[PDB]
JSON list of C-alpha atoms and ligand atoms in Angstrom, two decimals:
[
{"chain": "X", "resi": 6, "resn": "UNK", "atom": "CA", "xyz": [164.22, 192.63, 42.89]},
{"chain": "X", "resi": 7, "resn": "UNK", "atom": "CA", "xyz": [163.69, 191.21, 39.38]},
{"chain": "X", "resi": 8, "resn": "UNK", "atom": "CA", "xyz": [161.68, 192.82, 36.56]},
{"chain": "X", "resi": 9, "resn": "UNK", "atom": "CA", "xyz": [159.10, 191.45, 34.14]},
{"chain": "X", "resi": 10, "resn": "UNK", "atom": "CA", "xyz": [159.70, 192.25, 30.45]},
{"chain": "X", "resi": 11, "resn": "UNK", "atom": "CA", "xyz": [157.48, 191.74, 27.42]},
{"chain": "X", "resi": 12, "resn": "UNK", "atom": "CA", "xyz": [157.75, 188.94, 24.89]},
{"chain": "X", "resi": 13, "resn": "UNK", "atom": "CA", "xyz": [155.35, 187.21, 22.43]},
{"chain": "X", "resi": 14, "resn": "UNK", "atom": "CA", "xyz": [154.92, 183.49, 21.65]},
{"chain": "X", "resi": 15, "resn": "UNK", "atom": "CA", "xyz": [156.59, 182.13, 18.54]},
{"chain": "X", "resi": 16, "resn": "UNK", "atom": "CA", "xyz": [156.07, 178.41, 19.27]},
{"chain": "X", "resi": 17, "resn": "UNK", "atom": "CA", "xyz": [155.73, 175.86, 22.11]},
{"chain": "X", "resi": 18, "resn": "UNK", "atom": "CA", "xyz": [158.62, 173.36, 22.16]},
{"chain": "X", "resi": 19, "resn": "UNK", "atom": "CA", "xyz": [158.36, 170.97, 25.20]},
{"chain": "X", "resi": 20, "resn": "UNK", "atom": "CA", "xyz": [157.76, 171.02, 29.03]},
{"chain": "X", "resi": 21, "resn": "UNK", "atom": "CA", "xyz": [160.62, 173.34, 29.86]},
{"chain": "X", "resi": 22, "resn": "UNK", "atom": "CA", "xyz": [161.58, 175.16, 26.63]},
{"chain": "X", "resi": 23, "resn": "UNK", "atom": "CA", "xyz": [159.59, 177.60, 24.44]},
{"chain": "X", "resi": 24, "resn": "UNK", "atom": "CA", "xyz": [160.37, 179.87, 21.47]},
{"chain": "X", "resi": 25, "resn": "UNK", "atom": "CA", "xyz": [159.53, 183.54, 22.15]},
{"chain": "X", "resi": 26, "resn": "UNK", "atom": "CA", "xyz": [160.20, 186.85, 20.46]},
{"chain": "X", "resi": 27, "resn": "UNK", "atom": "CA", "xyz": [162.16, 189.00, 22.96]},
{"chain": "X", "resi": 28, "resn": "UNK", "atom": "CA", "xyz": [163.31, 192.60, 22.13]},
{"chain": "X", "resi": 29, "resn": "UNK", "atom": "CA", "xyz": [162.23, 191.83, 18.58]},
{"chain": "X", "resi": 30, "resn": "UNK", "atom": "CA", "xyz": [164.43, 188.66, 18.12]},
{"chain": "X", "resi": 31, "resn": "UNK", "atom": "CA", "xyz": [163.42, 184.97, 18.12]},
{"chain": "X", "resi": 32, "resn": "UNK", "atom": "CA", "xyz": [164.98, 183.11, 21.03]},
{"chain": "X", "resi": 33, "resn": "UNK", "atom": "CA", "xyz": [164.53, 179.67, 22.62]},
{"chain": "X", "resi": 34, "resn": "UNK", "atom": "CA", "xyz": [164.00, 180.00, 26.40]},
{"chain": "X", "resi": 35, "resn": "UNK", "atom": "CA", "xyz": [164.82, 177.33, 28.99]},
{"chain": "X", "resi": 36, "resn": "UNK", "atom": "CA", "xyz": [162.84, 177.66, 32.30]},
{"chain": "X", "resi": 37, "resn": "UNK", "atom": "CA", "xyz": [165.01, 178.34, 35.33]},
{"chain": "X", "resi": 38, "resn": "UNK", "atom": "CA", "xyz": [165.15, 175.97, 38.28]},
{"chain": "X", "resi": 39, "resn": "UNK", "atom": "CA", "xyz": [163.10, 173.07, 36.84]},
{"chain": "X", "resi": 40, "resn": "UNK", "atom": "CA", "xyz": [163.38, 169.82, 34.87]},
{"chain": "X", "resi": 41, "resn": "UNK", "atom": "CA", "xyz": [160.55, 168.29, 32.94]},
{"chain": "X", "resi": 42, "resn": "UNK", "atom": "CA", "xyz": [160.78, 164.70, 31.55]},
{"chain": "X", "resi": 43, "resn": "UNK", "atom": "CA", "xyz": [161.83, 164.64, 27.85]},
{"chain": "X", "resi": 44, "resn": "UNK", "atom": "CA", "xyz": [158.92, 164.13, 25.46]},
{"chain": "X", "resi": 45, "resn": "UNK", "atom": "CA", "xyz": [160.03, 160.50, 25.08]},
{"chain": "X", "resi": 46, "resn": "UNK", "atom": "CA", "xyz": [159.86, 159.82, 28.87]},
{"chain": "X", "resi": 47, "resn": "UNK", "atom": "CA", "xyz": [157.05, 159.18, 31.37]},
{"chain": "X", "resi": 48, "resn": "UNK", "atom": "CA", "xyz": [155.05, 162.46, 31.89]},
{"chain": "X", "resi": 49, "resn": "UNK", "atom": "CA", "xyz": [157.01, 164.08, 29.04]},
{"chain": "X", "resi": 50, "resn": "UNK", "atom": "CA", "xyz": [153.96, 164.36, 26.85]},
{"chain": "X", "resi": 51, "resn": "UNK", "atom": "CA", "xyz": [151.82, 165.71, 29.74]},
{"chain": "X", "resi": 52, "resn": "UNK", "atom": "CA", "xyz": [154.48, 168.32, 30.61]},
{"chain": "X", "resi": 53, "resn": "UNK", "atom": "CA", "xyz": [154.73, 169.46, 26.97]},
{"chain": "X", "resi": 54, "resn": "UNK", "atom": "CA", "xyz": [150.90, 169.63, 26.75]},
{"chain": "X", "resi": 55, "resn": "UNK", "atom": "CA", "xyz": [150.70, 171.67, 29.95]},
{"chain": "X", "resi": 56, "resn": "UNK", "atom": "CA", "xyz": [153.26, 174.28, 28.89]},
{"chain": "X", "resi": 57, "resn": "UNK", "atom": "CA", "xyz": [151.79, 174.46, 25.37]},
{"chain": "X", "resi": 58, "resn": "UNK", "atom": "CA", "xyz": [148.29, 175.11, 26.70]},
{"chain": "X", "resi": 59, "resn": "UNK", "atom": "CA", "xyz": [149.55, 177.68, 29.17]},
{"chain": "X", "resi": 60, "resn": "UNK", "atom": "CA", "xyz": [151.49, 179.72, 26.63]},
{"chain": "X", "resi": 61, "resn": "UNK", "atom": "CA", "xyz": [149.08, 179.42, 23.73]},
{"chain": "X", "resi": 62, "resn": "UNK", "atom": "CA", "xyz": [146.13, 180.62, 25.83]},
{"chain": "X", "resi": 63, "resn": "UNK", "atom": "CA", "xyz": [147.93, 183.62, 27.43]},
{"chain": "X", "resi": 64, "resn": "UNK", "atom": "CA", "xyz": [147.09, 187.09, 26.29]},
{"chain": "X", "resi": 65, "resn": "UNK", "atom": "CA", "xyz": [150.31, 188.42, 27.83]},
{"chain": "X", "resi": 66, "resn": "UNK", "atom": "CA", "xyz": [153.69, 186.60, 28.08]},
{"chain": "X", "resi": 67, "resn": "UNK", "atom": "CA", "xyz": [156.49, 188.07, 30.21]},
{"chain": "X", "resi": 68, "resn": "UNK", "atom": "CA", "xyz": [160.13, 187.14, 30.70]},
{"chain": "X", "resi": 69, "resn": "UNK", "atom": "CA", "xyz": [161.92, 187.68, 34.02]},
{"chain": "X", "resi": 70, "resn": "UNK", "atom": "CA", "xyz": [165.70, 187.18, 34.12]},
{"chain": "X", "resi": 71, "resn": "UNK", "atom": "CA", "xyz": [167.39, 186.39, 37.41]},
{"chain": "X", "resi": 72, "resn": "UNK", "atom": "CA", "xyz": [170.64, 188.04, 38.73]},
{"chain": "X", "resi": 73, "resn": "UNK", "atom": "CA", "xyz": [173.10, 185.78, 36.94]},
{"chain": "X", "resi": 74, "resn": "UNK", "atom": "CA", "xyz": [173.67, 184.22, 33.53]},
{"chain": "X", "resi": 75, "resn": "UNK", "atom": "CA", "xyz": [170.86, 185.10, 31.05]},
{"chain": "X", "resi": 76, "resn": "UNK", "atom": "CA", "xyz": [171.88, 182.62, 28.35]},
{"chain": "X", "resi": 77, "resn": "UNK", "atom": "CA", "xyz": [173.11, 179.07, 28.75]},
{"chain": "X", "resi": 78, "resn": "UNK", "atom": "CA", "xyz": [175.91, 177.23, 26.87]},
{"chain": "X", "resi": 79, "resn": "UNK", "atom": "CA", "xyz": [173.45, 176.36, 24.04]},
{"chain": "X", "resi": 80, "resn": "UNK", "atom": "CA", "xyz": [172.38, 180.00, 23.55]},
{"chain": "X", "resi": 81, "resn": "UNK", "atom": "CA", "xyz": [169.00, 179.43, 25.29]},
{"chain": "X", "resi": 82, "resn": "UNK", "atom": "CA", "xyz": [167.65, 182.35, 27.35]},
{"chain": "X", "resi": 83, "resn": "UNK", "atom": "CA", "xyz": [167.35, 181.42, 31.07]},
{"chain": "X", "resi": 84, "resn": "UNK", "atom": "CA", "xyz": [164.29, 183.02, 32.62]},
{"chain": "X", "resi": 85, "resn": "UNK", "atom": "CA", "xyz": [161.17, 182.73, 34.74]},
{"chain": "X", "resi": 86, "resn": "UNK", "atom": "CA", "xyz": [158.30, 182.93, 32.23]},
{"chain": "X", "resi": 87, "resn": "UNK", "atom": "CA", "xyz": [154.82, 184.27, 33.12]},
{"chain": "X", "resi": 88, "resn": "UNK", "atom": "CA", "xyz": [151.52, 183.66, 31.36]},
{"chain": "X", "resi": 89, "resn": "UNK", "atom": "CA", "xyz": [148.90, 186.24, 32.28]},
{"chain": "X", "resi": 90, "resn": "UNK", "atom": "CA", "xyz": [150.75, 186.85, 35.54]},
{"chain": "X", "resi": 91, "resn": "UNK", "atom": "CA", "xyz": [151.13, 183.14, 36.49]},
{"chain": "X", "resi": 92, "resn": "UNK", "atom": "CA", "xyz": [154.67, 181.68, 36.60]},
{"chain": "X", "resi": 93, "resn": "UNK", "atom": "CA", "xyz": [155.08, 178.65, 34.28]},
{"chain": "X", "resi": 94, "resn": "UNK", "atom": "CA", "xyz": [158.11, 177.37, 36.24]},
{"chain": "X", "resi": 95, "resn": "UNK", "atom": "CA", "xyz": [156.18, 177.28, 39.53]},
{"chain": "X", "resi": 96, "resn": "UNK", "atom": "CA", "xyz": [152.99, 175.92, 37.85]},
{"chain": "X", "resi": 97, "resn": "UNK", "atom": "CA", "xyz": [154.82, 172.86, 36.38]},
{"chain": "X", "resi": 98, "resn": "UNK", "atom": "CA", "xyz": [156.39, 172.02, 39.74]},
{"chain": "X", "resi": 99, "resn": "UNK", "atom": "CA", "xyz": [153.10, 172.54, 41.65]},
{"chain": "X", "resi": 100, "resn": "UNK", "atom": "CA", "xyz": [151.47, 170.08, 39.29]},
{"chain": "X", "resi": 101, "resn": "UNK", "atom": "CA", "xyz": [154.11, 167.36, 39.69]},
{"chain": "X", "resi": 102, "resn": "UNK", "atom": "CA", "xyz": [155.11, 167.80, 36.01]},
{"chain": "X", "resi": 103, "resn": "UNK", "atom": "CA", "xyz": [158.68, 169.06, 36.79]},
{"chain": "X", "resi": 104, "resn": "UNK", "atom": "CA", "xyz": [161.27, 168.57, 39.57]},
{"chain": "X", "resi": 105, "resn": "UNK", "atom": "CA", "xyz": [163.16, 171.47, 41.11]},
{"chain": "X", "resi": 106, "resn": "UNK", "atom": "CA", "xyz": [166.58, 171.05, 39.43]},
{"chain": "X", "resi": 107, "resn": "UNK", "atom": "CA", "xyz": [169.59, 172.90, 38.08]},
{"chain": "X", "resi": 108, "resn": "UNK", "atom": "CA", "xyz": [169.79, 175.26, 41.03]},
{"chain": "X", "resi": 109, "resn": "UNK", "atom": "CA", "xyz": [172.97, 177.21, 40.41]},
{"chain": "X", "resi": 110, "resn": "UNK", "atom": "CA", "xyz": [174.29, 179.86, 42.82]},
{"chain": "X", "resi": 111, "resn": "UNK", "atom": "CA", "xyz": [173.14, 183.38, 41.88]},
{"chain": "X", "resi": 112, "resn": "UNK", "atom": "CA", "xyz": [170.35, 182.46, 39.44]},
{"chain": "X", "resi": 113, "resn": "UNK", "atom": "CA", "xyz": [168.19, 181.10, 42.24]},
{"chain": "X", "resi": 114, "resn": "UNK", "atom": "CA", "xyz": [165.86, 183.89, 43.39]},
{"chain": "X", "resi": 115, "resn": "UNK", "atom": "CA", "xyz": [162.68, 181.79, 43.28]},
{"chain": "X", "resi": 116, "resn": "UNK", "atom": "CA", "xyz": [164.24, 178.59, 44.68]},
{"chain": "X", "resi": 117, "resn": "UNK", "atom": "CA", "xyz": [162.28, 178.48, 47.91]},
{"chain": "X", "resi": 118, "resn": "UNK", "atom": "CA", "xyz": [158.93, 179.35, 46.20]},
{"chain": "X", "resi": 119, "resn": "UNK", "atom": "CA", "xyz": [159.40, 176.39, 43.81]},
{"chain": "X", "resi": 120, "resn": "UNK", "atom": "CA", "xyz": [160.53, 173.92, 46.59]},
{"chain": "X", "resi": 121, "resn": "UNK", "atom": "CA", "xyz": [157.43, 174.83, 48.50]},
{"chain": "X", "resi": 122, "resn": "UNK", "atom": "CA", "xyz": [155.32, 173.96, 45.41]},
{"chain": "X", "resi": 123, "resn": "UNK", "atom": "CA", "xyz": [157.27, 170.69, 44.98]},
{"chain": "X", "resi": 124, "resn": "UNK", "atom": "CA", "xyz": [156.62, 169.72, 48.60]},
{"chain": "X", "resi": 125, "resn": "UNK", "atom": "CA", "xyz": [152.91, 170.25, 48.06]},
{"chain": "X", "resi": 126, "resn": "UNK", "atom": "CA", "xyz": [152.85, 168.31, 44.73]},
{"chain": "X", "resi": 127, "resn": "UNK", "atom": "CA", "xyz": [154.73, 165.46, 46.44]},
{"chain": "X", "resi": 128, "resn": "UNK", "atom": "CA", "xyz": [152.27, 165.51, 49.42]},
{"chain": "X", "resi": 129, "resn": "UNK", "atom": "CA", "xyz": [149.45, 165.21, 46.86]},
{"chain": "X", "resi": 130, "resn": "UNK", "atom": "CA", "xyz": [151.23, 162.38, 45.04]},
{"chain": "X", "resi": 131, "resn": "UNK", "atom": "CA", "xyz": [150.79, 164.20, 41.72]},
{"chain": "X", "resi": 132, "resn": "UNK", "atom": "CA", "xyz": [152.02, 162.88, 38.42]},
{"chain": "X", "resi": 133, "resn": "UNK", "atom": "CA", "xyz": [155.80, 162.33, 38.82]},
{"chain": "X", "resi": 134, "resn": "UNK", "atom": "CA", "xyz": [155.26, 161.73, 42.55]},
{"chain": "X", "resi": 135, "resn": "UNK", "atom": "CA", "xyz": [152.51, 159.14, 41.98]},
{"chain": "W", "resi": 201, "resn": "LIG", "atom": "C1", "xyz": [168.18, 174.98, 33.53]},
{"chain": "W", "resi": 201, "resn": "LIG", "atom": "C2", "xyz": [169.65, 175.17, 33.12]},
{"chain": "W", "resi": 201, "resn": "LIG", "atom": "C3", "xyz": [170.25, 174.25, 32.27]},
{"chain": "W", "resi": 201, "resn": "LIG", "atom": "N1", "xyz": [171.55, 174.35, 31.86]},
{"chain": "W", "resi": 201, "resn": "LIG", "atom": "C4", "xyz": [172.23, 173.30, 31.05]},
{"chain": "W", "resi": 201, "resn": "LIG", "atom": "C5", "xyz": [172.69, 172.24, 32.11]},
{"chain": "W", "resi": 201, "resn": "LIG", "atom": "C6", "xyz": [172.67, 170.90, 31.33]},
{"chain": "W", "resi": 201, "resn": "LIG", "atom": "O1", "xyz": [173.95, 170.72, 30.60]},
{"chain": "W", "resi": 201, "resn": "LIG", "atom": "P1", "xyz": [173.98, 169.31, 29.80]},
{"chain": "W", "resi": 201, "resn": "LIG", "atom": "O2", "xyz": [173.23, 169.41, 28.38]},
{"chain": "W", "resi": 201, "resn": "LIG", "atom": "O3", "xyz": [175.43, 169.20, 29.55]},
{"chain": "W", "resi": 201, "resn": "LIG", "atom": "O4", "xyz": [173.38, 168.03, 30.55]},
{"chain": "W", "resi": 201, "resn": "LIG", "atom": "C7", "xyz": [171.43, 171.16, 30.40]},
{"chain": "W", "resi": 201, "resn": "LIG", "atom": "C8", "xyz": [170.07, 170.62, 30.87]},
{"chain": "W", "resi": 201, "resn": "LIG", "atom": "O5", "xyz": [169.06, 171.25, 30.04]},
{"chain": "W", "resi": 201, "resn": "LIG", "atom": "P2", "xyz": [167.93, 170.21, 29.57]},
{"chain": "W", "resi": 201, "resn": "LIG", "atom": "O6", "xyz": [167.21, 169.59, 30.82]},
{"chain": "W", "resi": 201, "resn": "LIG", "atom": "O7", "xyz": [167.03, 171.05, 28.68]},
{"chain": "W", "resi": 201, "resn": "LIG", "atom": "O8", "xyz": [168.62, 169.07, 28.70]},
{"chain": "W", "resi": 201, "resn": "LIG", "atom": "O9", "xyz": [171.27, 172.55, 30.29]},
{"chain": "W", "resi": 201, "resn": "LIG", "atom": "C9", "xyz": [172.27, 175.41, 32.40]},
{"chain": "W", "resi": 201, "resn": "LIG", "atom": "O10", "xyz": [173.46, 175.57, 32.07]},
{"chain": "W", "resi": 201, "resn": "LIG", "atom": "N2", "xyz": [171.72, 176.40, 33.17]},
{"chain": "W", "resi": 201, "resn": "LIG", "atom": "C10", "xyz": [170.42, 176.27, 33.58]},
{"chain": "W", "resi": 201, "resn": "LIG", "atom": "O11", "xyz": [170.02, 177.13, 34.33]},
{"chain": "W", "resi": 202, "resn": "LIG", "atom": "CA1", "xyz": [164.32, 168.50, 30.44]}
]
């Protein structure tokens, strides 16, 4: 079992990174288990727009760390991020705006949930799968 913790928005960055205040400190978070296109790539802008809209409209942002590493080699927090109870990581995949990616042993709790969303986005031919 994982736990949701509070955080507040500082600023949207791109499809799979965001700046949040967590335990009172500014931190850039990278979303576990996904990969969005870079802003400069196809669907990059749409991914960035999606994440921005989702976080900027939320009344309540939460951070959920997995079992394993909580920061990556660049000092980014590694988390599942929720906006008003909806997971951003899963939402991007379900929409065909991210691929399931970077699945490392022991930070992979929600792997099967996200693959199931990817299968459905691919069936629908959405965005990246179009
Ligand atoms: C998502 C994730 C990325 N990373 C590192 C792997 C990649 O190293 P490299 O920079 O050497 O390619 C990079 C991809 O992040 P980005 O897709 O944001 O560039 O971030 C992790 O270490 N753990 C993770 O859980
Ligand atoms: Ca990326």
